[PDB]
UniProtKB/TrEMBL annotation:
Pfam families: DUF5597 (PF18120), Glyco_hydro_42 (PF02449)
Organism, as annotated: Cellvibrio japonicus (strain Ueda107)
Residue ranges occupied by any Glycoside hydrolase family 42 N-terminal domain in the UniProt entry: 41-191
GO biological process: carbohydrate metabolic process
Annotated ranges, domain DUF5597: 363-508
Molecular function per GO: beta-galactosidase activity
The keyword Nucleus appears for this protein: no
InterPro entries referenced in this protein's UniProt entry, alphabetically: DUF5597, GH, Glyco_hydro_42_N
Official protein name in the record: Beta-galactosidase, putative, bgl35A
Length: 525
């Protein structure tokens, strides 16, 4: 079975699984479900969601509870149970950092500060965040991580685990960097020539080279170097794709490093992270912003020629489901709502206030649009042209305001010879202006099959096609709309949309319909 691998060519990306592009339609457990007994409270949600991939912690404390005494009993049960249900895994290495802290390191690590030292603030007080310049901590982390990758090498020959997250939300809250004597001696010295060269700067000390950014850039570099060494070590055993997940700073008004998790893959240090950690496949945003404009900005910032988009975490409340559409539209490889288990916990106000079948259904309904075409969509996104949108007004908390909302709820997409107009919250007949869904929930996906032909599926929206350029006196129409499915990679037609179903755009409710739309311009001379 070919190793999973993250491919990057001509500004596009693909997660190869079993020798073909793959989309993670994911679900992540709560933080305390990484035990054999908890899995019974995980699988039912995953089945109701229709997820294809489960993200779940593997904690350093549980594989090495006593130094040198490894315990993979949980990984054994997890692999077995995942294969019975024919789903894949993303393991989350919870080790030196989990939300800035060492809580998931073994007691023999997190209680021995002299061996495994913490961030010291400028005032000399100590934060519960392990310093990236602790060489013992780096060696011990790597050692245990290598043993986990050895376990996968020997016991996961068919790659049930497709990707590994190295640490969980690295960084420090409460300070910008380590100010320990140890860290001070490294900070008061020359910037590594390798960072100097890879970045277009001039040789000198950290303060000389970076000025006002020296403290935060230093923390990012040293953390990025720690996480690269761990990643190189593990890849040496088994070369799986490996990524880091970011405690986002607000992109539009971040405040100061330390209010947000300093030293993580924040938007302002993606250049240090990419220069300092070339072995880490991608940097993934953890999205809990509710407002469309902020979420949209995060997707824009994390999708780069050098960075595949993977929404490694997103809130599991209703408004977040629709962001699947712009995530896949940007060439996203995956999307994983956080806390999708029945272990009696909710991260409200971040996620849903109540976890129940309705909570899961909001995501099941969007994943039902993509599951039937997952391999075809993944290939089109890598090799060709895709688009995706979400309803761009959030749920509400006179005559003019209705015109203003109608306009805001109308999106244009340039598909080459054809444009699509996407509108939200209106009847399936006639042209009454959009008033939006209550709550906000719609979105659309389009892939280009040919100059005049598109794959379309959408949710609580209307999609309408039109020419992209004025025609030289020709007219245009829909040539054919087919609803169908892929079987063995072949298109099977179920029915033709026509008449009422294509007079007033293409109207989608909550049910899944995958369309092939063929447009034509025609002479009337
Ligand atoms: C509104 S805001 O978006 O601006 N602020 C939100 C900042 C907090 C988001 C933390 C998300 C955490 N990611 C790591 C997971 O393991 C888990 O701890 C999760 C919280 O449940
Ligand atoms: Na892609
Ligand atoms: Na065009
Ligand atoms: Na169908």
């Amino acid at each position: 079975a070919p190793l999973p691998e993250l491919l990057s060519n001509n500004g596009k990306h693909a997660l190869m699984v079993d020798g073909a592009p793959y989309i993670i339609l994911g679900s992540q457990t709560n933080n305390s479900s990484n035990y054999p007994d908890a899995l019974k409270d995980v699988w039912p949600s995953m089945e109701k969601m229709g997820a294809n991939t489960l993200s779940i912690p593997v904690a350093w404390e549980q594989i090495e509870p006593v130094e040198g005494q490894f315990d993979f009993s949980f990984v054994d049960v997890l692999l077995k149970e995942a294969r019975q249900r024919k789903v894949r895994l993303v393991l989350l290495w919870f080790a030196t950092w989990k939300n800035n802290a060492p809580h998931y390191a073994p007691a023999w690590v997190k209680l021995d500060n002299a061996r495994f030292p913490r961030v010291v603030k400028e005032d000399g007080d100590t934060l519960n965040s392990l310093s990236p310049l602790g060489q013992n901590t780096l060696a011990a982390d790597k050692k245990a991580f290598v043993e986990l990758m050895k376990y996968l090498a020997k016991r996961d020959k068919d790659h049930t685990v497709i990707m590994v997250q190295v640490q969980n939300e690295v960084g420090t809250y409460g300070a910008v960097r380590d100010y320990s004597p140890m860290a001070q001696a490294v900070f008061n010295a020359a910037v590594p020539d390798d960072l100097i060269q890879k970045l277009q700067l001039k040789p000198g000390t950290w303060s000389q080279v970076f000025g006002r950014d020296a403290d935060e850039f230093f923390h990012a570099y040293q953390i990025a170097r720690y996480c690269d060494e761990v990643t190189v070590a593990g890849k040496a055993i088994k070369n799986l794709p490996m990524y880091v997940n970011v405690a986002l700073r607000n992109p539009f008004n971040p405040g100061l490093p330390g209010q947000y998790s300093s030293g993580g893959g924040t938007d302002n240090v993606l250049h240090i992270w990419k220069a300092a950690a070339p072995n880490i496949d991608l940097i993934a945003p953890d999205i809990y912003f509710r407002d469309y404009k902020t979420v949209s900005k995060v997707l824009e910032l994390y999708t780069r020629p050098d960075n595949a988009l993977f929404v490694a975490e997103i809130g599991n409340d209703q408004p977040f489901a629709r962001y699947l559409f712009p995530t896949l539209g940007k060439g996203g490889i995956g999307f994983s709502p956080f806390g999708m288990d029945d272990t009696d916990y909710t991260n409200y106000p971040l996620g849903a206030k109540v976890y129940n079948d309705e909570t899961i259904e909001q995501f099941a309904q969007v994943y039902r649009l993509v599951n039937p075409m997952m391999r075809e969509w993944a290939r089109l996104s890598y090799q060709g042209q895709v688009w995706g949108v979400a309803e761009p007004l959030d749920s509400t908390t006179k005559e003019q305001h209705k015109k203003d909302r109608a306009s805001a709820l109308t999106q244009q997409l340039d598909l080459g010879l054809w444009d699509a107009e996407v509108t939200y919250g209106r009847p399936m007949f006639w042209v009454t202006p959009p008033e939006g869904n209550t709550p906000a929930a719609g979105g659309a996906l389009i892939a280009q099959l040919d100059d005049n032909e598109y794959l379309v599926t959408a949710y609580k929206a209307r999609v309408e096609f039109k020419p992209s350029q004025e025609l030289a006196g020709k007219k245009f129409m829909i040539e054919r709309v087919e609803e169908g499915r892929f079987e063995k990679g072949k298109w099977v037609m179920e029915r033709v949309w026509n008449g009422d179903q294509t007079d007033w755009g293409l109207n989608f409710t909550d049910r899944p319909h995958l369309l092939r739309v063929k447009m034509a311009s025609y002479s009337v001379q």
